[PDB]
Write a protein that binds this DNA or RNA. Structure first.
Lengths: 53, 280, 52
DNA sequence: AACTATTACACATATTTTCA
DNA sequence: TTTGAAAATATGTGTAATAG
């Protein structure tokens, strides 16, 4: 019954990997959205330059 | 403003970049001299195409680096450095939850400005991570870029606003010694087959240095990982000789964008470098 | 023995781990929202320039 | 019972901040 | 000032007790 440790080992590892992958994904998502947001912003500024001839 | 801007319809360019490292200082410390250039001189930025005769205000502030969108860096602030043997440039300090310096741009000098009153302060991580709104952790986050802007008022009363940022800069004493870092790559692309030598020039390259290649989706997911074989037989001091690896799907019909980085141990990796494979 | 100080660290480290995720979600809502609106303002100007 | 997920603890490592 | 590091934190890993 030392296996108990071998498993709880993974048990803990599992949960930990879970909370990481989750947060990494989120970090990914926000980072991308900021990508998208700036693109709009630069566009919008390009149209305002275009507009006011 | 975290609002985007460009090199302009004229042009604000950095004639002399900063040194790759610059151990910044804390509030609990004696201030360090302002950022310098690799030549021992100082960083230099000027405005090309300014056929007018009135001094403007070039402003600088410490921006973010890494592979994100330029944003004022929350864990670092510009610092007005004390003085030089010759009062080089005067300064003006202001805010907006982040400090900003304004050195006058003289026509007399060709709209060129020698930056030598620009130091960098480091804030306690826990101190920042406190304010609500911040989502970035400072741990391991120690890179920066000097951001410079200019607002050109026109005869039409318009304001053509320009901005530029230097090359990344490491501020972490330890990191500057531990983390490797590419500053020049021999090639930016090649075709699917690979098998070509790319000369990578940077700092902190050892014999533990491995070069990894990655493929990621807009989804932010790693799709591919391939290690390249760097000639570790013999080489120069700080520069790796990389043999570009073959791409997974050699049958592509449109150019793919990939990344590669240098790594010396689990937690000692370079920032993501850019590279692209072309179809055949 | 110095363990008294660590129990305090971890507690904070964990607490902070969580707050991070929470703060990220709120930020996604915010961004998705902002971007939607901006996406519109884009189209809006688009037509306009296309009629000038 | 028997097993996995969770949370706090001590100790090992990694980075940051304070001092000399 | 500038440099190098000890001193102080912050975060990862293996356990143990415990809820589910």
């Amino acid at each position: 019954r030392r296996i108990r440790r071998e498993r709880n080992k993974m048990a803990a590892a599992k949960c930990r990997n879970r909370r990481r992958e989750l947060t990494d994904t989120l970090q990914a998502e926000t980072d991308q959205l900021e990508d998208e947001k700036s693109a709009l912003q630069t566009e919008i500024a390009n149209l305002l330059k275009e507009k006011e001839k | 403003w975290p609002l985007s801007s460009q090199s302009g319809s004229y042009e604000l360019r950095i004639e002399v970049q900063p040194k790759p490292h610059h151990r910044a200082h804390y509030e609990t410390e004696g201030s360090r001299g302002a950022v310098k250039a690799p030549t021992g001189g100082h960083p230099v930025v000027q405005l090309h195409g300014y056929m007018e005769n009135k001094p403007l205000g070039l402003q600088i502030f410490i921006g973010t680096a890494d592979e994100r969108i330029l944003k004022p860096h929350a864990f670092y602030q510009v610092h007005r450095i004390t003085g030089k043997t010759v009062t080089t440039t005067s300064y003006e300090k202001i805010v907006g939850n982040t400090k900003v310096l304004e050195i006058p741009l003289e026509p007399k000098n060709n709209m060129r400005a020698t930056i030598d009153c620009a130091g960098i302060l480091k804030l306690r991580n826990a101190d920042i991570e406190l304010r609500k709104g911040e989502t970035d952790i400072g741990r391991k986050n120690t890179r920066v870029r000097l951001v410079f802007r200019v607002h050109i008022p026109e005869s039409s009363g318009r304001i053509v606003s320009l901005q530029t940022a230097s090359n990344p800069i490491e501020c972490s004493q330890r990191s500057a010694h531990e983390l490797p870092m590419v500053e020049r790559q021999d090639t930016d692309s090649c075709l699917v087959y690979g098998g070509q030598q790319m000369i990578l020039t940077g700092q902190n390259f050892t014999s533990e240095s491995k070069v990894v290649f990655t493929e990621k989706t807009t989804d932010g997911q790693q799709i591919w990982e391939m290690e390249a074989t760097v000639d570790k037989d013999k080489s120069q001091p700080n520069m790796l000789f990389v043999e570009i690896p073959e791409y997974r799907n050699k049958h592509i019909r449109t150019p793919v964008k990939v990344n590669f980085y240098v790594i010396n141990g689990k937690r000692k990796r370079s920032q993501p470098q850019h590279f692209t494979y072309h179809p055949v | 023995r110095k363990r008294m100080r660590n129990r305090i660290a971890a507690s904070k480290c964990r607490k902070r781990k969580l707050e991070r995720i929470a703060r990220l979600e709120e930020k996604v809502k915010t961004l998705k929202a902002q971007n939607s609106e901006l996406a519109s303002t884009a189209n809006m100007l688009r037509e306009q320039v296309a009629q000038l």
